[PDB]
RNA sequence: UGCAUUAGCUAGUUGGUAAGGUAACGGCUUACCAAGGCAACGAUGCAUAGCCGACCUGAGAGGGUGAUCGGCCACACUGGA
RNA sequence: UUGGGCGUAAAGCGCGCGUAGGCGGUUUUUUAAGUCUGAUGUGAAAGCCCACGGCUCAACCGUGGAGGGUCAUUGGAAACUGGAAAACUUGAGUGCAGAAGAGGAAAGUGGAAUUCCAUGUGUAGCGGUGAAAUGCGCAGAGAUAUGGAGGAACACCAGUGGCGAAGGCGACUUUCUGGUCUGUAACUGACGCUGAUGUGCGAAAGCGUGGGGAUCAAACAGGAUUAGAUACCCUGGUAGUCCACGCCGUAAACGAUGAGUGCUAAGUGUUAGGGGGUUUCCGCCCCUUAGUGCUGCAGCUAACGCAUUAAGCACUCCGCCUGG
């Protein structure tokens, strides 16, 4: 450009739309508004619990859950681990962390934190999935 | 659009010095009567649009001479504004 | 309607420096002749020569080279322009190619050079990083 | 700080003319005079946010945080006297 | 900014013209404003230069100048910018001698054609078909000429011709002109460029009027083909067509290259003006200008390809762009 017209119009920087839009939002419960305070994990409660097919040619059924957060936003959150305590209405904790090859669902479910305990039969991934260190 | 004797007629009555063609005032009757020509000559031909900017682009070519009449000598600009009829 | 005299004059040098010329000139002024003097004061060319004509006469260049059919003038660039008039401080003034170029200095001390303003303790309007 | 997917903004306003009254100033209000003054350099309005030091990472060109830790401003259920 | 691109990748509206704005040729003299320096005060507390002291190390707190080397109080210097006084003309305009035309708005001359009505003429087919048929034929359908008419344009001169900013411009004779260009360069002394605003044009189709339905032709129709129709075939035929009378504001409006100025290998035709040597019985060779074109260095890019009618080497302005 010109440094003349750069005075007339400056180099305005570019924005970056950040991932996980449901974790940087609160709710003014008194005034029905929304805060923005960027939690690590905002807790919620399950509404539906199901599974999903990866559309990429890897084949499995990975378990997801329709969770509503504190700020009442409904998500589809991946439930890692094998067994669970997530039949319905479990008051759970939810992280970020997208699971790839799975459309729409881009949230994890914090194992063993809020109302679930973690999975039992793990011995190489013991710190995750709610398992206390043995002996 | 303008004949040779007619410009060489106005250099007798309106020049600033001898061999002074290109003067500010020597393209005013050359400008505005040839406007008044084309004002009636495009009154005949209502689609003489290229001959329309032929005189308007030399409005500024005279106006820049009026613009040049400010900075060098302003008494010549009081002279030449009040010489003929030109607004502003 | 050219705006930088001392740049188009400087790039015309590099315009014929590419095709290995030994003889060109440039128009004159109060400055540009004396600007061309500071080139041949250091002596990067054979001799820059006399101004002759009516208005801004041609003052020659006589491009002086190496014996391996080479060229000496690597890099030719005015830094200032109409729109950006740049200046220099004497206390942190750099060295072109870390001691292998020159950088002239323009003020009302006379238009001076890198040596002629480092021990003059004035800066000024810098022009050429020519090495 | 940003929006012209905010352009025409103001009418005690705009200058002055006399009374106040203030620790002082005046369009600050009141009677008078001209529409003036303010504007695309975006006035006006909207939305957002206490400010600065300071933090922080950047080669420098620097710009993002304020729990900090200091300096200033504003507030004390709300709104007036 | 330092430290990005706008021909095919994302980055030029369809072109302009133009208001503001920005940025402007050349050569002299004043200031010291801007520049750059010099005397100090001199810039912040944990944060910040350098070296110690305090912490068992250290985590964590002080010391000493550095100290501002940025701001102010102060002195100055004019090349270059700001203002002040001049000139030169390349650049531009006003001159003069001429070339060309499809450049826009108005009047004439005639040709040829599809359609019609009539003569002569005649009677079995005429038209249309890749294949046949619908149709048009017994009224004479067409035909056929000295000769009767209509609609609408006007092959030939027709071209990597010319003019127009662009959309564009075509039988011409004339009207009014635009504008291009060369040459002499007389003169004013840079009178310029971008070009936000604004104003125009704005191709085709569409909203409508009057000539329009002669031909063409969406929509519609007919005949069959074809395994499939009314599709590829065919006509008839509606507005729309043609033009004038109102526009809309859109195109691959693309040279997919914004506009003005300097500089770096060539050859090669061609359009207009000036330059000639022989001459030619109007023709050969060659200088130049402005261009119209075709090949082709260095440089260029990712390569294509560009290279005097740059995407090369520099300057000024506007606009645009930054994953789909």
- Chain A 1-40, CB below 8 Å of chain C: which residues? 2-4
* Cα–Cα distance for residue pair A106/A134, rounded to 1 Å: 32
| Sheet strands (E) in chain C | 25-26, 59-60
Nearest CA in chain A to C83: A4
Q: What are phi and psi of A94, to 5 degrees?
A: -130, 125
Residue A71 vs residues A27, A109, B48, C1: alpha-carbon distances, Å: 5, 17, 71, 65
- Chain C 71-130, CB below 8 Å of chain A: which residues? 83-84
- Residue C116 neighbours by CB under 8 Å, 6+ apart: C105
Taking phi first (over 0 means left), then psi (-120 to 50 degrees means alpha), and beta for anything else, what does residue A104 get? left
Any idea what the Cα angle at residue B50 is, between residues B46 and B41, rounded to 5°? 45
Whose CA is closest to A77, among A58, A91, A63? A63
Residue C68 vs residues B43, C63, C65, C72: alpha-carbon distances, Å: 76, 14, 8, 11
Helix axes B29-44, B4-13, angle to 10 degrees: 140
Yes or no: say if C120 and C109 are a contact pair by the CB < 8 Å rule.
yes
* Cα–Cα distance for residue pair A26/A113, rounded to 1 Å: 20
- Determine whether the distance from the CB of B17 to the nearest atom of strand E is below 7 Å: yes
- Determine whether the distance from the CB of C96 to the nearest atom of strand E is below 7 Å: no
Yes or no: say if A48 and A65 are a contact pair by the CB < 8 Å rule.
yes
Q: What are phi and psi of C88, to 5 degrees?
A: -135, 150
* Cα–Cα distance for residue pair C23/A83, rounded to 1 Å: 89
| Sheet strands (E) in A23-85 | 42-52, 62-69, 77-78
Residues of A within 8 A of C79 (CB-CB) are: none
- Residue A70 neighbours by CB under 8 Å, 6+ apart: A26, A27, A42, A43, A44
SS3 at position A94 = strand
- Determine whether the distance from the CB of C28 to the nearest atom of strand E is below 7 Å: yes
- CA–C1' distance A36–D72 (Å)? 29
* Cα–Cα distance for residue pair C76/C17, rounded to 1 Å: 10
* Cα–Cα distance for residue pair B37/A72, rounded to 1 Å: 79
10 Å Cβ neighbour count for C105?
25
Q: Are strands C25-26 and A93-94 parallel, antiparallel or unpaired?
A: unpaired
Q: Would the CA dihedral through C112, C115, C121, C127 be positive or negative?
A: positive
Yes or no: say if A116 and A92 are a contact pair by the CB < 8 Å rule.
yes
> Which nucleotides of chain E does any protein CB come within 7 A of?
1, 4-6, 17-19, 22-29, 34-38, 69, 77-80, 84, 86-88, 90, 92-97, 103-105, 164-165, 176-179, 186-193, 200-201, 260-265, 298, 312-321, 323
Residues of C within 8 A of A4 (CB-CB) are: 83
Question: Helices H, strands E: what count in chain C?
Answer: 3, 2
The structure tokens listed for A27 are 């709710």
* Cα–Cα distance for residue pair C40/C21, rounded to 1 Å: 17
Please count the CA atoms within 13 angstroms of the CA of A38 that sit on its side-chain side.
2
- Residue A7 neighbours by CB under 8 Å, 6+ apart: none
Residues of C within 8 A of A3 (CB-CB) are: 83-84
Element (H, E) at A66: strand A62-69
* Cα–Cα distance for residue pair A115/A86, rounded to 1 Å: 9
- Mind spelling out the 3-state secondary structure of chain C? CCCCHHHHHHHHHHHHHCCCCCCCEECCCCCHHHHHHHHHHHCCCCCCCCCCCCCCCCEECCCCCCCCCCCCCCCCCECCECCECCCECCCCCCCHHHCCCECCECCCCCCECCHHHHCCCCCECCCECEC
- CA–C1' distance C66–E264 (Å)? 22
How many residues are there in chain A?
A: 135
CB pairs under 8 A between A and C: 4
DSSP letter for each residue of chain B: ---HHHHHHHHHHS-SSTT-TT-SGGGTHHHHHHHHHHHHHHHHSTT--TTHHHHHHHHHHHHHHHHHHHHS-SHHHHHHHTTS----
- Mind spelling out the 3-state secondary structure of B41-60? HHHHCCCCCCCHHHHHHHHH
**Nucleotide nearest B73 (Cα, C1'):** E85
Characterize B9-41 residue by residue with b for buried, 16 or more Cβ atoms within 10 angstroms of its Cβ, and e for exposed.
Answer: ebeeebeeeeeeeebbbbbbbbbbebbeebeee
The structure tokens listed for A18 are 């950040």
* Cα–Cα distance for residue pair C36/C44, rounded to 1 Å: 10
Yes or no: say if A50 and A36 are a contact pair by the CB < 8 Å rule.
no
Nearest CA in chain C to A6: C83
Yes or no: say if C101 and C75 are a contact pair by the CB < 8 Å rule.
yes
Q: What is the DSSP letter of C97?
A: G
Residue identified by tokens 């080139």 is: C39
- Residue C69 neighbours by CB under 8 Å, 6+ apart: C20
How far is the first Cα of chain B from the last one, in angstroms, to the nearest whole number? 27
């Amino acid at each position: 450009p010109t440094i003349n017209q750069l005075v007339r119009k400056p180099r305005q920087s570019k924005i970056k739309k950040s991932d996980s839009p449901a974790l940087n939002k609160g709710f003014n419960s008194k005034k029905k508004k929304f805060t923005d305070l960027n939690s690590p994990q905002k807790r919620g409660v399950c509404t539906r619990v199901g599974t999903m097919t990866p559309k990429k040619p890897n084949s499995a059924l990975r378990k997801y859950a329709r969770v509503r957060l504190s700020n009442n936003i409904e998500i589809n959150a991946y439930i890692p681990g094998i067994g669970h305590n997530l039949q319905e209405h479990s008051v759970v904790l939810v992280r970020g962390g997208r699971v790839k090859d799975l459309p729409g669902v881009r949230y994890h479910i914090v194992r063993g934190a809020l109302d679930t305990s973690g999975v039992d039969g793990r011995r190489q991934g013991r710190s995750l999935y709610g398992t206390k260190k043995p002996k | 659009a303008i004949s040779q004797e007619r410009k060489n007629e106005i250099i007798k009555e309106y020049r600033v010095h001898e061999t002074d063609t290109g003067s500010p005032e020597v393209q005013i009757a050359v400008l505005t009567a040839e406007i008044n020509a084309v004002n009636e000559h495009l009154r005949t031909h209502k689609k003489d649009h290229h001959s329309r900017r032929g005189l308007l682009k030399m409005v500024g070519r005279r106006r820049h001479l009026l613009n040049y009449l400010r900075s060098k000598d302003i008494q010549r600009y009081r002279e030449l504004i009040k010489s003929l009829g030109i607004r502003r | 309607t050219m705006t930088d005299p001392i740049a188009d004059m400087l790039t015309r040098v590099r315009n014929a420096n590419m095709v290995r010329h030994e003889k060109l000139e440039l128009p004159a002024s109060n400055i540009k002749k004396e600007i061309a003097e500071i080139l041949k004061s250091e002596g990067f060319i054979k001799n820059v020569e006399y101004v002759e004509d009516d208005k801004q006469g041609v003052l020659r260049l006589f491009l002086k080279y190496g014996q391996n059919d080479e060229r000496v003038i690597t890099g030719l660039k005015r830094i200032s322009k109409p729109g950006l008039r740049v200046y220099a401080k004497a206390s942190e003034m750099p060295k072109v190619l870390n001691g292998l170029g020159i950088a002239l200095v323009s003020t009302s001390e006379g238009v001076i050079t890198d040596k002629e303003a480092r021990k003059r303790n004035v800066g000024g309007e810098i022009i050429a990083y020519v090495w």
